[PDB]
Amino acid sequence: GRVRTRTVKRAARQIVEKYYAKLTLDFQINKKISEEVAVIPSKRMRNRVAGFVTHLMKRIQKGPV
Amino acid sequence: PAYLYETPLETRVHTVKDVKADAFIALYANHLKKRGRFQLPKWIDYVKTAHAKELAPYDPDWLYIRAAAILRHLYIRPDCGVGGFRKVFSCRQRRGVRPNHTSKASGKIIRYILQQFEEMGLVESDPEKPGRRLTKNGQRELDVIARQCAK
Amino acid sequence: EAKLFGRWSYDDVNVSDLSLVDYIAVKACVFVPHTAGRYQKKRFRKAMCPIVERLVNSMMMHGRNNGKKTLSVRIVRHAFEIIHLMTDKNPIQVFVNAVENGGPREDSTRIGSAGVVRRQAVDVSPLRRVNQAIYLICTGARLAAFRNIKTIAECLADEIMNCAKESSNAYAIKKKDEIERVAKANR
Amino acid sequence: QPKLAKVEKVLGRTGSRGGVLQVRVTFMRSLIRNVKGPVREGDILALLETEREARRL
Amino acid sequence: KKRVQTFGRKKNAVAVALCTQGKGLLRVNGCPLEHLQPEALKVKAFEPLLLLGKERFQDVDIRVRVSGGGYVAQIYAIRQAIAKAVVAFNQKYVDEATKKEVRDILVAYSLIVADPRRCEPKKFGGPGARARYQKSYR
Amino acid sequence: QRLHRIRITLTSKDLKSIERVCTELINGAKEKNLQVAGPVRLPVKTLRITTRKSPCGEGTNTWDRFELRIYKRLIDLHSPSDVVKQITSINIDPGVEVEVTII
Amino acid sequence: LFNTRPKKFGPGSRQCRVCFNRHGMVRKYGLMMCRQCFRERANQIGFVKYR
Amino acid sequence: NHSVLFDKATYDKLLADIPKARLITPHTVCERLKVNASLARQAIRYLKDQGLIKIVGEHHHSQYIYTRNTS
RNA sequence: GUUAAUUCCGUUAACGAACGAGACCUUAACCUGCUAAAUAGGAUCAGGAACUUCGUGUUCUUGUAUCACUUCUUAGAGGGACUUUGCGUGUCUAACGCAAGGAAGUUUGAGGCAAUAACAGGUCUGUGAUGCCCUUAGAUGUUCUGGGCUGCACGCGCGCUACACUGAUGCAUCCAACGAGUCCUUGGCCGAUAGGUCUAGGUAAUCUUGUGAGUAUGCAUCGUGAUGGGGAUAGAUUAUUGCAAUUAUUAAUCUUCAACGAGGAAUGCCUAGUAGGCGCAAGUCAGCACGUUGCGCCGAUUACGUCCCUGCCCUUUGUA
């Protein structure tokens, strides 16, 4: 299954705390946005965190998280 | 229910590649007898055509069809020689109890037919250039009978 | 358009009976039984293939005869010609009516209620009844011509016509009733 | 002889080896039956016995 | 001159079908499609002719150049390269609306897509890829 | 001087060692602005040995799959040989075999 | 006279430079390395295993 | 089990015998007759050239399969 | 509850951490984009041959011939999947299922790497890794001639070829990828064959080589007979490697023509380019593959579940 580890969680969770402004519900701007603000070494990891950032932004849109 | 389909235009009958390759050999084998020129070996009783084969060929005109097949095969690949023609008529030898392997063709019979075409002068060297090739008279011998067989 | 071998038309004809309907893949259809395509990722892509493809695909056995689909295309192309020869109509309508009647209705599973290996009556699904139909068609035709100097195409043509029929001479229609012998008793 | 019946829903999966599978049917009424092969919802199958209901589980 | 060139891929086969304006002649290396043994699969090559029609192809010609794969894989490369040619022939020259007809009638029937099943590598302690030899016990 | 043609071979084990040299020597040519073509990357000659892991026969018969990789790459030029000796002699790399050749 | 046969070919001709052992002699690309000897020093030569 | 020559008693019958039958194969000759399959090939090749019968399909090199001519 | 997972959300006398897992690395899939290639080609523009002479009408071939190009070929830079979107399923938290789209949606496929504890596992015959013991010139050091490891009343284990007609045999047609060479071998003559002989290219994307591989396809003969299926066993001859071929190193040519008619009880391997079949290449190698390690080609059947057998992991539980 596609369950994400605490290294994937912490990074994506820390972005929406402080950089909540900017990134939209949209993915393909967030993939780009995540890389610039913070260092992510690999290409596979940058999508997986950025997918979870947009998952959090949907949950922030839906209610208080 | 008859069979469907054509090409858009009715196919041109000019060169040898348009002819189906087995039906070419059926005609030109008979051409070698009725012309007369080409000439027989002594050894025809023996042979079988390969080291790998365990039996002699059934048809008594096995040499003419081989000389028919090799002459058109010069038109397909221009440059080739005797070790080349050993590969093209290769076959599965049956080793025995062991697993099967490839093996090369006979070198006497494949060389001799080329020397008989050299005597007429359809296929020739090429003394410096490595590998035999068909000449000008070689093509017009082929291409005149390409139109005949479909007709 | 779409015809098998160009001599037959998929258009027209019909499924024989309710059930085993839609499981079969006709309707649209491909000239030539053969298709190399992905049919085994989901578990009901198996009934997207047209059953003439599933016949030629499962006709290769055993270890020696596996592969060589081009070879199984030929002997089925001859078989559909022979079916046409006798009781001429549609090879496909006779073949579809064969694989309708070919496979078994019920089956004995082992449910013991702990300890024992005890049999119990269970009806067969529509997919498995098509799976068993085409298998039982071929294993009659292969066994029929295994030692006899009879071409496999002959066995297949004969086997298919017999299955459509209620003769029971066939290996398939026997092995239907051989299972339904014991499946009656296990009730 | 055989009388046709439509699947409402798969109920579970039955037996020790788990090959046989349990189904609610509806005639063409309802009862529970066991079936062999791959089966899904939106499906129709023949029964020789219109009676003979399978254990719930 | 009107030119597009296109490729198909079954397995390790590949087949560059050049096509141009001309008389209506479809050729592999320099055969007709009438040959192409196995002959049984000869019908298979003619697949884009039967679906689309004869009177579209008579405005053009196609000339295919094939290597790789085997016997059956070379047919599926040519099968794709003829179908991919006439679809791609529109983009450059012929009206762009008729591409949506001629493509999607073939897609309604992987003639442009090319299925990427390739041979999985062998691993040690076995004859095949996933197959293993035999354990003995006692 | 005379109209010459030079095509310099480059080979090493590393990728990163040559990608220094390919970037540097083209810019070293573009000091003088010679007729440069770009670096022609040939196919990779992967060498392979498979030995058994164990010293003796015991256990399951497991295997290493060792590999080298070799990277032939070719910088093209059209220039005399006296000009090129300045470019090659400065910026020699550690563990990269290089050989200059006319024609 | 003594202390030499013809020693030109076969496993008796040649030995492992590192450990003097004929058995398991890897001669691909002219290594002349006994396998026990070769595997542990393979990273230092250049050979890095993957897949 | 089988007879290898023509059997020139049955040659006079064999003009009548085979054009009756619906299936004409290798097998259907030695069905009606009790001779090896090989004669059957040269029989139905003879019944092509001299006699009546016609191919179901243009041809094949393994399974022959003729019909009666119906004339 | 959820996951391939001590993976997550959550519950809490626990709180905050580390290794393992994951990430990572290599390879396979798609880019008419980026950046290029007389050691990969294509297209051009002019010439040659042949048939047609239909006409720039189809098919071969030619050149540091060109002007100029990168779709295949090659490989650096990168892009690309996040289960995105829709509807179900859940404290709708973690996340599952199904359908559409897409090159690709099981973590996209397949491997490498591999923790803590160990086991009296194996290896002193891989070693200049080594303690102790043995023996050290009438030797267990070393090396030379010859034999042996291959010796056969009989058990057991991995493989190969078989039993045929979806076949065997003889002719013709035309298609792969991994390698590998200071030995690999084209070209021309001699020879049934093997092989030899005289030139000849190659430090290899240049030469062998586009390695014209075999299952395959087309056309013939054979006819269910252990037959032409099967090729063991055996005599006789001709070459090849080596200093030496006998217990026959192989390869050929002719004969010789057994068992075996789908395998008893037991039991192995395997879920998609996979099984199985069909070849090829490399490792050991003077010579010898029925073996192993990689590589492609032809390409199915049947599941998408389960704890019954055989084992495994975690709880509560019983133990002499």
Classify residue C39 by burial, with Cβ atoms within 10 Å: 0-12, 13-18, 19+: middle
Cα B91 from Cα B93, distance rounded (Å): 6
The 10 Å Cβ neighbour count of residue F2 is: 5
- DSSP secondary-structure letter at E40? G
Cα B91 from Cα A52, distance rounded (Å): 61
- Cβ within 8 Å, pair C70-E38: yes
Q: How far does E3 lie from chain C, in Å, by closest CA?
A: 31
**What's the half-sphere exposure (Cβ side, CA atoms, 13 Å) at C56?**
23
Cα-based distances in Å from E37 to B8, E41, E74, H22:
21, 7, 11, 33
Say which nucleotide is closest to residue B131, CA to C1' distance. Answer: I187
With left for phi above 0 and alpha for psi between -120 and 50, is residue C44 left, alpha or beta?
Answer: alpha
Number of continuous H segments (helices) and E segments (strands) in chain G: 2, 2
**Positive or negative CA dihedral for D6, D8, D10, D15?**
negative
Cα C149 from Cα H2, distance rounded (Å): 13
Q: β-pairing, E26-28 with E60-67?
A: parallel
Q: Per 3-state DSSP, what percentage of chain A is helix, strand, and coil (rounded to 5)?
A: 70, 0, 30
Cα E106 from Cα E90, distance rounded (Å): 15
Q: Are B105 and B85 in contact (CB under 8 A)?
A: yes
With left for phi above 0 and alpha for psi between -120 and 50, is residue F66 left, alpha or beta?
Answer: beta
* C78: phi then psi, degrees, rounded to nearest 5: -75, -40
Structure tokens at F47: 């060498």
Q: Which residue from C78, C149, C150 is facing H65, i.e. has the nearest CB?
A: C78
The one-letter code for the residue type at F34 is L
Q: Give the total residue count for chain D.
A: 57
| Domain span including residue D18 | 1-57
**Positive or negative CA dihedral for A13, A14, A20, A22?**
negative
- Please report where in the chains the tokens 């085979």 appear, as a residue: H18
Structure tokens at B99: 């697993």
Distance of CA E83 to the CA centre of its chain: 7
- Cβ within 8 Å, pair F49-G36: no
Question: What residues have CB less than 8 Å from E40, skipping those under 6 apart?
Answer: C32, C70, C73, C74, C77
Q: Which own/partner contact pairs does A28-32 have at CB distance under 8 Å and 24+ positions apart?
A: A30/A54, A30/A57
Q: Are C31 and E43 in contact (CB under 8 A)?
A: yes
Q: Are C102 and C176 in contact (CB under 8 A)?
A: yes
Cα E131 from Cα E126, distance rounded (Å): 6
Q: Are A51 and A45 in contact (CB under 8 A)?
A: no
Q: Are B131 and B123 in contact (CB under 8 A)?
A: no
Q: Are C52 and C3 in contact (CB under 8 A)?
A: no
Question: Residue C152 CA to nucleotide I166 C1', Å?
Answer: 7
Q: Which own/partner contact pairs does E52-55 have at CB distance under 8 Å and 24+ positions apart?
A: E52/E86, E52/E102, E52/E105, E52/E106, E54/B6, E54/B8, E55/B8
Q: What are the structural domain ranges in chain B?
A: 1-151
Cα B85 from Cα C60, distance rounded (Å): 35
Q: Which residue from F53, F65, F68 is facing G46, i.e. has the nearest CB?
A: F68
Q: How far does F62 lie from chain E, in Å, by closest CA?
A: 7
Helix, coil or strand: residue H3: strand
Cα-based distances in Å from F22 to B137, F19, F25:
55, 5, 6
**B9 close contact with E: CB closer than 8 A:** yes
Give me the torsion for CA of E4, E10, E14, E17, rounded to 10°: -30
* H5: phi then psi, degrees, rounded to nearest 5: -75, 170
Q: Which of A64, A56, A14, A57 has the alpha carbon at shortest distance from A39?
A: A14
Question: Residue B96 CA to nucleotide I230 C1', Å?
Answer: 10
Q: Which H/E stretch holds residue B74?
A: helix B62-76
Describe the crossing of helices C152-164 and C126-144 by its angle, rounded to 10 degrees: 130
Cα E55 from Cα E49, distance rounded (Å): 9
Classify residue F84 by burial, with Cβ atoms within 10 Å: 0-12, 13-18, 19+: buried
- Cβ within 8 Å, pair G50-F49: no
Q: Are B30 and B148 in contact (CB under 8 A)?
A: no
Helix, coil or strand: residue C183: helix
Chains H and C touch (3+ CB pairs under 8 A): yes
Helix, coil or strand: residue B57: coil
**Positive or negative CA dihedral for H25, H30, H32, H33?**
positive
**C75 contact residues in H (CB cutoff 8 A):** 63
**C-alpha angle D24/D26/D32, rounded to 5°?**
30
Question: What residues have CB less than 8 Å from A57, skipping those under 6 apart?
Answer: A16, A20, A23, A24, A25, A30
- Cβ within 8 Å, pair C109-D36: yes
Q: Which own/partner contact pairs does D12-21 have at CB distance under 8 Å and 24+ positions apart?
A: D12/D57, D14/C111, D14/D57, D15/C109, D15/C110, D15/C111, D16/C110, D16/C111, D16/C112, D17/C110, D19/C109, D20/C109, D20/C111, D20/C122
| Domain span including residue F63 | 1-103
Question: What residues have CB less than 8 Å from B23, skipping those under 6 apart?
Answer: B149
The resolution in Å comes to: 3.3
**Positive or negative CA dihedral for F94, F96, F97, F100?**
negative
The CATH number that applies at residue A15 is 1.10.60.20
C interface with E, Cβ–Cβ below 8 Å: 1, 5-6, 31-32, 34, 36-38, 70, 73-74, 77
Direct distance between the N- and C-terminal alpha carbons of chain D, in angstroms, rounded to an integer: 29
- DSSP secondary-structure letter at A20? T
* H23: phi then psi, degrees, rounded to nearest 5: -85, 130
- Report whether the peptide linkage leading into residue C34 is cis, meaning its omega lies within 30 degrees of zero: no
Cα-based distances in Å from H27 to F79, G8, H24, H59:
82, 68, 8, 17
**C73 contact residues in E (CB cutoff 8 A):** 40
**C-alpha angle G34/G39/G40, rounded to 5°?**
115
Neighbours of chain H (3+ CB pairs under 8 A): C
**C-alpha angle C159/E38/C84, rounded to 5°?**
30
Helix, coil or strand: residue B28: helix
Residue with nearest Cα to nucleotide I290 C1'? B98
Q: Are A49 and A8 in contact (CB under 8 A)?
A: yes
Structure tokens at H26: 């290798």
Which residues is E112 bridged to in the sheet? none
Q: Are D7 and D39 in contact (CB under 8 A)?
A: yes
Helix, coil or strand: residue C53: helix
With left for phi above 0 and alpha for psi between -120 and 50, is residue D2 left, alpha or beta?
Answer: beta
Q: Which of C62, C61, C63, C71 has the alpha carbon at shortest distance from C33?
A: C71
In B53-151, DSSP assigns E strands to: 91-93, 101-103, 123-124, 133-134
Question: What residues have CB less than 8 Å from A62, skipping those under 6 apart?
Answer: none
Q: Which H/E stretch holds residue H23?
A: strand H23-24
Helix, coil or strand: residue C184: helix
Number of continuous H segments (helices) and E segments (strands) in chain H: 3, 3
Q: Which of H1, H49, H44 has the alpha carbon at shortest distance from H23?
A: H44
Cα E112 from Cα H34, distance rounded (Å): 56
Count the domains in chain F: 1
The CATH number that applies at residue E50 is 3.30.230.10
Cα H71 from Cα H69, distance rounded (Å): 6
Question: What residues have CB less than 8 Å from E41, skipping those under 6 apart?
Answer: C32, C34, C70, E72, E75
Cα E114 from Cα E134, distance rounded (Å): 37
Q: Which of H67, H20, H28, H22 has the alpha carbon at shortest distance from H48?
A: H67
Interface test with H, best of C74, C80, C85 (most H CBs within 10 A): C85
Q: Are D26 and D37 in contact (CB under 8 A)?
A: no
The one-letter code for the residue type at D23 is V
Helix, coil or strand: residue A44: helix
- Cβ within 8 Å, pair C123-D17: no
Cα B130 from Cα E37, distance rounded (Å): 32
Count the domains in chain A: 1
With left for phi above 0 and alpha for psi between -120 and 50, is residue F38 left, alpha or beta?
Answer: beta
Cα C185 from Cα C117, distance rounded (Å): 16
Q: Which residue from H37, H60, H65 is facing C82, i.e. has the nearest CB?
A: H65
Q: Give the total residue count for chain A.
A: 65
- Please report where in the chains the tokens 């299936």 appear, as a residue: H23
Cα F31 from Cα E92, distance rounded (Å): 43
- Please report where in the chains the tokens 């141009």 appear, as a residue: E20
Q: Are E51 and E59 in contact (CB under 8 A)?
A: no
Helix, coil or strand: residue D37: coil
Q: Which H/E stretch holds residue F9?
A: strand F6-11
Three-state SS for F20-81 is: HHHHHHHHHHHHHCCCCEEEEECCCEEEEECCECCCCCCCCCCECCEEEEECCEEEEECCCH
Q: Which residue from C85, C149, C153 is facing H63, i.e. has the nearest CB?
A: C153
The 10 Å Cβ neighbour count of residue E53 is: 12
Question: Residue B116 CA to nucleotide I101 C1', Å?
Answer: 67
Cα-based distances in Å from C61 to C65, E41, E99, H40:
5, 22, 44, 29
Which residues is F63 bridged to in the sheet? F52
Distance of CA C57 to the CA centre of its chain: 11
Helix, coil or strand: residue E89: helix
**C-alpha angle C169/C172/C174, rounded to 5°?**
55
Neighbours of chain F (3+ CB pairs under 8 A): E, G
Q: Which CATH class is domain C1-187?
A: mainly alpha
Q: Which of B79, B45, B84 has the alpha carbon at shortest distance from B63?
A: B45
Describe the crossing of helices C152-164 and C91-102 by its angle, rounded to 10 degrees: 70
Query: Which of E 67-96 lie inside 8 A of B, CB atoms?
Result: none
Question: What residues have CB less than 8 Å from C110, skipping those under 6 apart?
Answer: C117, C118, C119, C120, D15, D16, D17
**C-alpha angle B76/B82/B88, rounded to 5°?**
50
Q: Which of C98, C93, C122, C127 has the alpha carbon at shortest distance from C109?
A: C122
Question: What residues have CB less than 8 Å from H10, skipping those under 6 apart?
Answer: H17, H33
**C-alpha angle C122/C128/C130, rounded to 5°?**
130
Q: Which residue from C86, C150, C153 is facing H22, i.e. has the nearest CB?
A: C86
Architecture of the structural domain at G1-51: Irregular (4.10)
| Domain span including residue A34 | 1-61
- DSSP secondary-structure letter at H35? B
- Cβ within 8 Å, pair G51-F65: yes
Strand I: positions under 7 A of a protein C-beta atom: 2-5, 7-9, 21-30, 32, 35-39, 42-43, 49-52, 54, 57-61, 64, 71-77, 79-85, 93-96, 99, 103-107, 109-113, 121-123, 126-127, 129, 142-145, 157-162, 164-167, 169-182, 185-195, 205, 209-225, 231-232, 242-243, 251-254, 262, 267-280, 282-287, 289-308
| Domain span including residue E3 | 1-138
**What's the half-sphere exposure (Cβ side, CA atoms, 13 Å) at E12?**
5
**C71 close contact with H: CB closer than 8 A:** no
The one-letter code for the residue type at E131 is A
Cα-based distances in Å from A60 to A6, A16, A53, A57, E48:
20, 10, 10, 5, 52
Cα A24 from Cα A29, distance rounded (Å): 7
With left for phi above 0 and alpha for psi between -120 and 50, is residue E65 left, alpha or beta?
Answer: beta
Q: Give the total residue count for chain C.
A: 187
Query: Which of C 3-42 lie inside 8 A of B, CB atoms?
Result: 3, 6-9
Q: Which H/E stretch holds residue E105?
A: helix E97-108
Helix, coil or strand: residue E8: strand
Distance of CA G37 to the CA centre of its chain: 8
**Positive or negative CA dihedral for B70, B76, B77, B79?**
positive
The 10 Å Cβ neighbour count of residue C5 is: 20
Structure tokens at E97: 């609306």
The most distant pair of C-alpha atoms in chain F lies apart, rounded to whole Å, by 70
Cα B59 from Cα B57, distance rounded (Å): 6
DSSP string computed for D10-24: EEEE-SSSS-SEEEE
- Cβ within 8 Å, pair C81-H57: yes
Direct distance between the N- and C-terminal alpha carbons of chain H, in angstroms, rounded to an integer: 35
